[PDB]
């Protein structure tokens, strides 16, 4: 579709049949079709996780302007005491995520092989694409048209860049992502990466 850089030609292997195809591959990673098949799923999962991560790192700090709750910052949330030890929670998380991610992985190898429930055999996911399971994962039956997929990919890429910015700013400034915005909005020409 669109060109990431006018005046340059698109790669041959990027034919525009994929969602969010702007012909961006200067370093040629996806020349091998198997690499492309793996990297599509990698991008999807990374974007979907980063969107939730950013949403959870930003909004629980926006409370200061509205003053509903009192929650520690995203980099101090770990040290707080909880009803269970950190090791127990980590063990349970590992136990569940092992099964979940092994179930997801088998679809990439042999599509359509894990669409059936293992305990209640009368239940099965409708046939779909590799990275878009559907079924009970889509309770509202929204149509997965190409426009919605492109919107999803754009939001995922933006959120990934936002998470990288959130990580890098804290190492330098030492404050929260929202506090960095208000300081910039106070004196825009004096509060940038160039401190002076």
């Amino acid at each position: 579709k669109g060109e990431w850089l006018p005046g340059l030609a698109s790669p041959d292997y990027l034919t525009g049949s994929l969602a969010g195809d702007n012909g961006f591959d200067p370093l040629g990673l996806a020349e091998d079709p198997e690499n492309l098949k793996w990297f599509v799923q990698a991008e999807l999962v990374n974007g979907r996780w980063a969107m939730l991560g950013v949403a959870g790192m930003l909004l629980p700090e926006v409370f200061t302007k509205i003053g509903i709750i009192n929650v520690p910052e995203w980099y101090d949330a770990g040290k707080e005491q909880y009803f269970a030890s950190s090791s127990t929670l980590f063990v349970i998380e590992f136990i569940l995520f092992h099964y979940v991610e092994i179930r997801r992985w088998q679809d990439i190898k042999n599509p359509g092989s894990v669409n059936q429930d293992p305990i209640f055999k009368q239940y099965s996911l409708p046939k779909g694409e590799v990275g878009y399971p559907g079924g009970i994962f889509n309770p509202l039956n929204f149509a997965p048209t190409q426009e919605a997929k492109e919107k999803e990919l754009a939001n995922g890429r933006l959120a990934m860049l936002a998470f990288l910015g959130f990580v890098v700013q804290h190492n330098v400034t030492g404050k929260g992502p929202f506090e960095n915005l208000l300081q910039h909005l106070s004196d825009p020409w004096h509060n940038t990466i160039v401190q002076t």
Partner: protein, 152 residues
């Protein structure tokens, strides 16, 4: 105290070495007028020596009985900056260089006279290939999985 060693900051022999070096540097300065350039150079040398000794004291090195720092390479987390991190950086750089060389060699293998492209380098193609080695681990690992790394 690994292997019976002692921290540099508590070592008396380390301080004695510093004092001897500084005293040796100071005896040469008495031969020159304070305003002269050699006096300025000797002052800079003395300041640099003091700074080097202070920095070695700060980083948590270990000294022996001779007052000289020793390196621990067994993998202990308290000394990862001595061997592990520079090793990983060197491995990354060497893999970059090797991958770029292999890519350039493969690129010109299909030409009519591949030998002439080795004594007279094709600058634009190499420049285009130079940037690609920045992600060499991913490309090498995926090539290994696909079986294209080893010649048949």
């Amino acid at each position: 105290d690994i292997s019976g060693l002692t921290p540099c900051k508590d070592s008396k022999q380390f301080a004695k070495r510093e004092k001897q070096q500084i005293k040796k540097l100071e005896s040469s300065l008495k031969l020159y007028a304070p305003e002269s350039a050699p006096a300025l150079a000797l002052n800079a040398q003395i300041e640099k020596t003091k700074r080097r000794f202070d920095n070695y004291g700060k980083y948590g090195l270990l000294c022996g009985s001779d007052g000289l720092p020793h390196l621990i390479v067994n993998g202990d987390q308290r000394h990862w900056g001595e061997f592990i991190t520079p090793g990983i950086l060197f491995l990354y750089i060497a893999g970059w260089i090797g991958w770029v060389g292999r890519s350039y060699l493969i690129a010109i293998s299909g030409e009519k006279k591949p030998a002439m492209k080795e004594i007279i380098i094709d600058v634009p193609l190499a420049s285009r290939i130079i940037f690609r080695g920045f992600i060499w681990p991913v490309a090498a690992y995926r090539e290994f999985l696909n079986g294209d790394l080893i010649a048949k």
